[PDB]
Amino acid sequence: MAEDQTVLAIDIGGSHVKIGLSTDGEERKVESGKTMTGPEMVAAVTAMAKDMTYDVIAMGYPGPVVHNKPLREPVNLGEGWVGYDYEGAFGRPVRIVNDALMQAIGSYNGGRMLFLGLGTGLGAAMIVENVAQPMEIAHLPYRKGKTYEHYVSEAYREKKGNAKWQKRVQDVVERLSAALEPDEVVIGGGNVERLENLPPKCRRGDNAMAFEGGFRLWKNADLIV
């Protein structure tokens, strides 16, 4: 039964690989960094989890994913992630989604929800009527000369300050909301603690929602995607 599986959720980022079990939610982590390869991640997780019991794995991957297969190598990690046999390497079934999609799933409380992930990269996902869809917005033109990701970068924040960057984040939220008509917008990623005063229909996601999204990916049978 899908609902009964014990899940090991893996949140992969440019700084750490974080893991947690559905049976307790307790986090362990190890450094990743710019050279960590796919195989190196698997070996690091396996070692971290050596005294844990898990049936299945859910992985939140910092790049595009199609049907549990990474499509692109990670921007801020090493190579060897695309085409790798994660299921054989872990010796367990594995589901893999883009990292923003995983946090979106964990944040979902019903209806039409847009998730915006303010991390090293700009991520997004949307869930409607329990159907979750990943999005790629980082490369889209916000205006001529300027992609969405460039428009809200940490580089801009460290230059012009929290107040002006927050206004640019609000601009992005308004533009996506006009396109997609969500009931609510959840803002997560590591940078979400940097935002002061959210507009109506907006809430802060908690980082715990990455693991919860991983647990849901297997255990919640109302989820499509």
Add this chain to the structure above:
Amino acid sequence: DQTVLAIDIGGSHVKIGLSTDGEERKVESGKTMTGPEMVAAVTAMAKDMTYDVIAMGYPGPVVHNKPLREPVNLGEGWVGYDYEGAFGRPVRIVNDALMQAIGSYNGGRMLFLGLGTGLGAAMIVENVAQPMEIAHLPYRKGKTYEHYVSEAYREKKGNAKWQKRVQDVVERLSAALEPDEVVIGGGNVERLENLPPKCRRGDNAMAFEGGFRLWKNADLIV
């Protein structure tokens, strides 16, 4: 028993097909066509047809039936537009490559590549269809996937070189995604000659079939 009007929106024409008798019509679109202009053009072109619902294949990224980006090769006013109200019918919208993929699907793990002005892709596994955006992804030598397989590349470099690049892209995507088969469609499918094993030539009529399936197929997910 719903009758579906499938709309295949491209840079040169908007083509429609009706599920009940498979009749096909077309009219020119062009570089400045707006969303509202498309709806008016389609409604006039389909004036004497009876249709219950609409399936639209949009030349851009779509999220839960809503266009995410204005089309690269058409005009503006597509994002945020109330298609359902403008048509007076229920409307489902997916990316153009996804609709053709849906129409081409015969089971198993199928990767679809659409070769036209640009590069589209979608993948279906066990009746679950997922759109892909590969055009902007890095391929080689600081160039994207779409750079090597675009109509621009074919016209400049010749059919022989272009076909080899298409082959390379299919091999790279196949190694990433492990499909059982690869279906190649789009306006340039007829320019490919000697397809490798596991690769088959799509039929562009499958755009309409995909639209019909988006409403009528009881197993399709997405």
